[PDB]
């Protein structure tokens, strides 16, 4: 399944990693089209004028969300990436609203990245400071270093963390 | 300013000024804005400003003692719900901190 | 491109810590607590005690935070004032931010505020106590090495062998210099 | 501890550059002008056009500066509001300080302000014009090296033997990447 | 309503579209009952109308003022008066000329 | 008598002598005062066991208070620390050494050490000299803990026509005029 | 060139010939970056520009200022701002009306 | 030992009256307004429009006063220049003093200046209008007596029994002789 | 109760009269000694070295100020005299200060009257032009004419004055 | 309509006199000299000692007059400044005008200045000495009569009988009133 | 011929009186036409449109000067009127210049008396303070008092006055 | 301190306590090289320092000015020179002695 790991010891190429932390910075919010069967990126062919998905033939794509933010737990800082319905659940805003807002921002004369960053820093600034437990895989990007791509996130279980910290206190040797 | 300190109502100290309580409501008087809080060791009549708790809702209150000739009543400032809560860990951590703080703060030098 | 992780503190650790402000452009301001811990970003949990006072032109916004050991000012200037609008008096918030000093009184420049549940507050107390104990024992075992020789290659090697992080020696040296 | 020198600028260039905000801790904010010049600190000379506005509780202070090509706000927060009291309307001041952005309008966070003699104003004009000419020429020479060849070690050697600073190529690359 | 810079201009060269101008001259006449003075810089004479303060006669000043243009005439409403008595004027005109002949060409160089 | 030489802050190196630098005051580090001989104006030592000040040039002399100023100079191409001694310090600041000594004493009576009192005095009362153009002369030394330091013998205010002449010459070298 | 007195007028009836006016209103919005405020006395809204001082929002003021009439618009350049917070406005309007209805007739009476 | 009371006037009437200068020692200067009213001392309420001008050696001091009907200069020579220092720009003052003429332009030689509340300004308006109307009526009645009959011992009796002051006929005749 | 009357109709010997006006001149300001119980003029005896108040026996002198000014209201001019703490309130300066100033002037070699006049005309000249309402009784001094001995003074109530002027206009027949 | 005549004085009499300023409107200011003489308008003859100082805006003009006994200021305000232009330093002038006091020093408010010849100056000396002697003897005659009864009907009648002008009794009465 | 008289003792109807004094105020300077040979006022008769002198027939009038000023002595103040060439000698300005000055003043909107007063108080202010001797006859005017209409004037003689005051001093009894 | 009055004396009676001198006398010699001239009152000769104006031989003159007492000699720092060609000097002398005789007694008599 998933293996618990500390941010201090995260290394590239690791798989099935569980981290707990708090959100410290939000970088990007974006939406883009994907296949309605495998939820995978579809290529808009100029010669055909349609969105081809080279695993199910021609399909009609649907919008899905991508979120880029940062996690900290007191021992390190890791940039993390959240996908699809998890981002909608975390943010609480339906994806079509994000799409409409980002087109409205880009209509003023901003590129895709500028609109994404402005939208992240101007509306979804209220999620940072909140705790989150992420499960995912560690990838290395040549320009950004370590990125934890989270398959899913689930709220912190207080009792499990309390018993973990108590057992670590026993390892310390107070009781 | 004075930080808020938490205890039991039966162990209220005359030197202490600001109090934090976690307790059980039994009754409330609207006209005087009184209500009763029970922490398991005693019952305190504490004065909410405008909020009013419900019977069956465990209440945490941050307030100030008013030691007058009218009785012992707490000038409550903050009222919050703790009905979904554990406290055995609360007494555990309070006694742990109380036991190890005095030597810890005296440990090391400069 | 490296961000020093925020560290979790009591309010008292900040109040009578030592504020060290850097002079170079490529170095940030920091704090050295009483028991020789270097702190860059504070990360506190506590209840709010008073209404958020925000300027009508919303240039500045500040409020008070209390948890049981002291009362700290949380500030936001220019763009950050939005955070001061997120809170109301009476609830428990987690505040993460930087440390700055104004009129011989410490304060926190806000970077994020979030409403939270009391069990998180008790977990905060647990984590603060755990972090305090380990560093206090590490400082205790490093004091002997510091008072033995000083900052020398042999001292660095023996500290590495004993398992003590190197930067504690320099932090102790700077604190010792600040004392006198 | 390294402190970067301040550059003498036209207010028009400050108001028309691109503000790059650092994300790490050990890097400061900066601004890239229209002709590929990185600036960390600004230093301008001009006339104060309005009475300084100081908040009732002296938490901040500001004033406007005009020199002939633009009009810019100069700010000071917390204890730097003292500087906002050293000047009055009609003065001929010299201001040195960092560059900040708020509500898509550039502003200067003041570090020092001091009155000058009109001959100092004329020196400001001469010296800023020469300092602009020199860098315009160097950037015009380096742009061809960037476009024909790119970012390679051999391109760095070419720039070295042609008399152009190494960092200028990276600045041009960043300007291209921000203007794309 | 962005604030406009004081477009530095000669007395004889004041255009029609100007809204704020900055002049340098020497005073030749001052009228205290009406609070006015006459500024003469060599190429013309301008009737500057002060609000509360007046300069002396014979000293060189620099006046930053808002231009009021009605059927009554043209007169500069002085806002800022600075004493430029011991300033170097020849070097100032030389640098103004150099800047004027160079800067318009400079902006055209380089691309993106 | 050796003459002084202009030199850009960018290319000055340790061990140079008779260096002249024009710049803007960008930071005020410290202002302090201490005792010196009333004849040769040199550092004299007060002995606790002897209760007197000993000048190793004149014997026993009565101490006189003189100030030291420590600031930073910036001129578009670099940043360098500068230290001023004695008379020039109160000439630049405009405050006699007696007042500085009294203020340091009052600061120390609040429980602050010498360094903290000096820094607070520099940053709380003499902050109005930042942003001033000056031309300093002195010798450049290298302190193992602070880097390059320019110890100044004298300072003067600038000279707006000579500087314009220099800038015109440099523009002529570029080839515009 | 005697300066004209401040002809006291309501916002809705500022005629074209006026060069200086004196208005009484209550502030409704203040902009500090541009130093402007909106004056509203019930019959209109006027965008009053200021040089150095601004009033607070919600208080009644009396503003004596010039007229700047260009194609950019018509904005009143405030010269004197006075705090009329606790003045009896109904008595003021009654006396204004009575003065207006009486004085033009009074001057006609008597002869040489 | 008699002092004539001061009258409350519009600045227009002060600026449009005829100034009569006495030649004897035991008579003061005065002014006859357009409706046959002799005034010895003036008393006006209005706004100071400009900062007072005081000579470098405090020989004299002056300031301008506006009330909505005219703008008048107020002067003080020798030791009365002290009054010119009691006011600044924008205040709403009340001025009492004599009337003087210099270069065909009426001016007030100040005897006292003092700030007032806006309600005092409204009282000034009410009172000046009311006391103008009374004298207009009385002069209109007395003008017919003067025109039909003239100055005769019986004309004095007629004016006495009609309720009109005796001096009014004399001032009417003086006005006729001055404006003829 | 008091009666409001215009200065034109003030006759000698009338009592309980109230006058509205403007301060047109400041004649004198000075200090003297009075009983600490009745606040009445007491006599210091050189041969006895004590102050005698013949309803009080021996008492310790206290300082009382006299202010002497002139009031004008468009129809006349009348002298007014204020006593004790009322002058202290109107001037705003404690009687000990006036006493020490007049002493300092007397030390210059100037008589009492001249020192009082110079103090009035060189320091308290800023009250000229102030609009007030005084109350008292009128007396006929053989060297000065009519004098109004004020018992109390107050500030003007502007709304009532507007009401009075409106009533007068209504009687005239315009409103 | 009465212009009562000017009187001729030494400078010391004016400087060491008693300035009595009137309070009523129908009475002018005057001077009472040491030997009980009432003076309204001074008429002096003497040489000018320094250059006439006149304001550039010609509001005021003043100069010094010397005759060997003292130094006197001759002033002219507003329209009278023309007189200050009629004189040049080094000549003998006759000056006629009123007396006024400014900063406990006597000065003459000018009303007429004319160039004169030395022989009329010695005529001036003759006339002032003769008038001084005559009034001195009259005052000596009146002293014992004043000290006899005071101001009574019998004293007035006897003074009339032996030929003393009545106003002298009042002049010494006021002198006694002001000396105390 | 002419007899000396003190100003204090001047009475109405007195004849052939000379006084010595100083000019204290100038009232007016004017000109008007008169018969060229006998120096008398000529009337511009509207019935004939010519200037008639009703003692010599038709004549062509010439302009002459009239000057009203004030003389003082230290014992009293009197008004003095000079006529014709005497005024020209005293002032030094030919009557035609006064004529054009008067008409220019009148063209601005001023009456004849206003122009006279303005000219007297604006340009002829430099004769005040000069010593003079006046000779003439005293007349009484109902609204103006005593006017010493001067037939002639001369510069004051010094030796005669010195000897007169010397003999007055001998009468005093000093030498 | 006010400025002192002038005191008139003769050459032979120049007192040490005198400060400023008025003299009437005869020119006998003028030296333009040093701007000096000799003045004779009859009882002696005094050297007078002319500043810019110089009299003529045959013109009897009166000088008001300052005395300079140094080790080199006694010379008068002249301030004003005037023509008295015509003058009754005997009358001046007789009135001077008459004044010196009576004025000291005149001041003493009549107490207050
Ligand atoms: Zn698919
Ligand atoms: Zn020594
Ligand atoms: Zn008593
Ligand atoms: Zn004839």
Numbering used by the authors:
A (entry chain J), I (entry chain G), K (entry chain D): 184 to 358
B (entry chain L): 8 to 117
C (entry chain K), D (entry chain B), H (entry chain H), J (entry chain E): 2 to 181
E (entry chain C), G (entry chain I), L (entry chain F): 6 to 117
F (entry chain A): 182 to 358
Question: What text comes from the article?
Answer:
Replication Protein A (RPA) is a heterotrimeric single stranded DNA-binding protein with essential roles in DNA replication, recombination and repair. In Archaea, the same function is also fulfilled by a heterotrimeric RPA. We report three crystal structures and five cryo-EM structures of Pyrococcus abyssi RPA (hereafter referred to PabRPA), in its apo form as well as bound to ssDNA. We find that archaeal and eukaryotic RPAs share a conserved heterotrimerization core, which is composed of three OB domains connected through a three-helix bundle formed by a C-terminal α-helix from each subunit.
